[PDB]
Amino acid sequence: HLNYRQKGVIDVFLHAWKGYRKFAWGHDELKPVSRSFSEWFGLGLTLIDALDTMWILGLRKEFEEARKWVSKKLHFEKDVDVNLFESTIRILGGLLSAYHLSGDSLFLRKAEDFGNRLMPAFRTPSKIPYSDVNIGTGVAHPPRWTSDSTVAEVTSIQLEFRELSRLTGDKKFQEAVEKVTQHIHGLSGKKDGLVPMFINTHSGLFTHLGVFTLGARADSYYEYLLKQWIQGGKQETQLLEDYVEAIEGVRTHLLRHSEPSKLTFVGELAHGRFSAKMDHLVCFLPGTLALGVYHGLPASHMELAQELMETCYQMNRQMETGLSPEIVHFNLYPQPGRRDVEVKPADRHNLLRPETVESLFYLYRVTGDRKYQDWGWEILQSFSRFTRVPSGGYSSINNVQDPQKPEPRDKMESFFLGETLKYLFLLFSDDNLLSLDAYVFNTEAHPLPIW
Ligand SMILES: CO[C@H]1O[C@H](CO)[C@@H](O)[C@H](O)[C@@H]1S[C@H]1O[C@H](CO)[C@@H](O)[C@H](O)[C@@H]1O
Ligand SMILES: [Ca+2]
Structure with a gap:
C-alpha cells in the first residue's frame, strides 16, 4: 500500500506533470511561470526522463500517454548538436529503464537508434570522446575554445x-566506453585517486593539472567506478581499486570540519591550496558511500557517509527556505554571528x-534510520512551499535565503521528475522495490539491472 508521504510525492508529481502536459507536451522543458516551454535537444527530454518515475509511482495512464508520444513523435534525425553525456544519462538511460520496467520493446528500439547516432563522438585520436555530436549529420566536435x-x-x-550492448548483442557500445575507462585507469596526474577535471581528446592526457574537486566536472567519475563494479557482478577489480583509492584521497586531502558545528565537508584543492567551497553536486557522495557499504565496502565509508549526510541536510535546513543553494562555502575558524553554511x-x-534526497534514499535503505525519511519530507515540504507554480509545475528559484521572494527562474529541470521525486518516493517506501541487490541507478536516477 502507498503511505501518506508517498501520496504526497504523487500529488507533487501530478501537479508538476499537469503543467508539463498543458504547456510543454513533447518539449524538452516546462517554463511553468510563463506557461511555455524551452528546447535544447528537441527530444521531449522531460517526458523521457520521467517515464520510469511515472511507472514506479503507479501513474500508468500517464505512462501510456507518454508511450504513445514516444511511439509516434520521437525521432532522432534532426540536425542538432547534443552533449554526449547529457544525452546518455537522460535519454539513453531513461529509455533503457523504461524498457526494463515496462517490458515494452519500443523503448529498446529507440535506445538503440539513439545509441548508434552517438557513436561518432568516439572517433578521436585518443578514443576519448568529443563533448558534442550531431545526431542527424554524424559530425562530432569538441567545444569551440578547446579540444578537451x-x-x-x-x-x-x-x-x-x-x-x-548487453541487450542488443552489438558490442560496439561497450567497447567504446570501456576503452575510456581502461585508459583513464592508467593516466598520470591523479592525487591519491582524485582526478583532474579535463582530458584532452587528441593526446588522451589530463589537463588542468593539480586542481581537484568532487563537484561539477568530476563527481560522477567516482560514482561510476563503484556502480560499474556493482553492475558487472563485482568482478572488475580495477574499478573497485580506483574507487577505494579515491575515497582515501578524499579523506586525506579534501575533508575538513566547519565552524561552529564541526560538520564534515568536502572542499576543493588547487596546487595544494585548500578551498572550503562545496557544490551541492557533492551531496551525491554520502549516498554512493552507503551504497558501497551495502555491497561490502569498509565501515569507514559508512562513518563518512553519515557525517556527510548530516552536512548535506544542514546545507538545506540552514537556509531560510530550507533548500540548499547551488554552492556553499564553510568557515574553518569561528566567525561571530555566522552559520556553518555560507x-x-x-x-x-x-x-x-x-x-540530497538521492543520498537520503541510500542512507535510509542501508541503515534503516527513519530520521533520513523525516529529513526528506522536510525538504519536499520546502519544495512545495517555495517552488510550486499555481497553474502547474514547479520552478527553480533564484534565492533560497528569501522565503517571501524566492524569485522563480521559470524553469523545471528534467531531473526534478526524473530524479528528485523518484528518490523521494523510494525513500518513503515501506517496500522488494528496486532492490540494491537487483538494480543500480544511473546518475540520472534510471535503474539498470545488475548482471
Ligand atoms: C554542471 O554540472 C553538471 O554537469 C557536470 C558535467 O559537465 C557534472 O559533473 C555534474 O554532476 C552536473 S550533471 C548531474 O546533476 C544533475 C542533477 O543535479 C543531473 O543531470 C544528473 O544528476 C547529473 O549527474
Ligand atoms: Ca547525478
Whole structure:
C-alpha cells in the first residue's frame, strides 16, 4: 500500500506533470511561470526522463500517454548538436529503464537508434570522446575554445552503453566506453585517486593539472567506478581499486570540519591550496558511500557517509527556505554571528536538484534510520512551499535565503521528475522495490539491472 508521504510525492508529481502536459507536451522543458516551454535537444527530454518515475509511482495512464508520444513523435534525425553525456544519462538511460520496467520493446528500439547516432563522438585520436555530436549529420566536435572533454562526462556514460550492448548483442557500445575507462585507469596526474577535471581528446592526457574537486566536472567519475563494479557482478577489480583509492584521497586531502558545528565537508584543492567551497553536486557522495557499504565496502565509508549526510541536510535546513543553494562555502575558524553554511550572493539559486534526497534514499535503505525519511519530507515540504507554480509545475528559484521572494527562474529541470521525486518516493517506501541487490541507478536516477 502507498503511505501518506508517498501520496504526497504523487500529488507533487501530478501537479508538476499537469503543467508539463498543458504547456510543454513533447518539449524538452516546462517554463511553468510563463506557461511555455524551452528546447535544447528537441527530444521531449522531460517526458523521457520521467517515464520510469511515472511507472514506479503507479501513474500508468500517464505512462501510456507518454508511450504513445514516444511511439509516434520521437525521432532522432534532426540536425542538432547534443552533449554526449547529457544525452546518455537522460535519454539513453531513461529509455533503457523504461524498457526494463515496462517490458515494452519500443523503448529498446529507440535506445538503440539513439545509441548508434552517438557513436561518432568516439572517433578521436585518443578514443576519448568529443563533448558534442550531431545526431542527424554524424559530425562530432569538441567545444569551440578547446579540444578537451570533461572528465565526469567521459566516465559517466559507461553503465548505459554497457547495458545497451548487453541487450542488443552489438558490442560496439561497450567497447567504446570501456576503452575510456581502461585508459583513464592508467593516466598520470591523479592525487591519491582524485582526478583532474579535463582530458584532452587528441593526446588522451589530463589537463588542468593539480586542481581537484568532487563537484561539477568530476563527481560522477567516482560514482561510476563503484556502480560499474556493482553492475558487472563485482568482478572488475580495477574499478573497485580506483574507487577505494579515491575515497582515501578524499579523506586525506579534501575533508575538513566547519565552524561552529564541526560538520564534515568536502572542499576543493588547487596546487595544494585548500578551498572550503562545496557544490551541492557533492551531496551525491554520502549516498554512493552507503551504497558501497551495502555491497561490502569498509565501515569507514559508512562513518563518512553519515557525517556527510548530516552536512548535506544542514546545507538545506540552514537556509531560510530550507533548500540548499547551488554552492556553499564553510568557515574553518569561528566567525561571530555566522552559520556553518555560507552562501555567496551569486550562488543562492536552487534548481530542484536531487543529490540530497538521492543520498537520503541510500542512507535510509542501508541503515534503516527513519530520521533520513523525516529529513526528506522536510525538504519536499520546502519544495512545495517555495517552488510550486499555481497553474502547474514547479520552478527553480533564484534565492533560497528569501522565503517571501524566492524569485522563480521559470524553469523545471528534467531531473526534478526524473530524479528528485523518484528518490523521494523510494525513500518513503515501506517496500522488494528496486532492490540494491537487483538494480543500480544511473546518475540520472534510471535503474539498470545488475548482471
Ligand atoms: C554542471 O554540472 C553538471 O554537469 C557536470 C558535467 O559537465 C557534472 O559533473 C555534474 O554532476 C552536473 S550533471 C548531474 O546533476 C544533475 C542533477 O543535479 C543531473 O543531470 C544528473 O544528476 C547529473 O549527474
Ligand atoms: Ca547525478
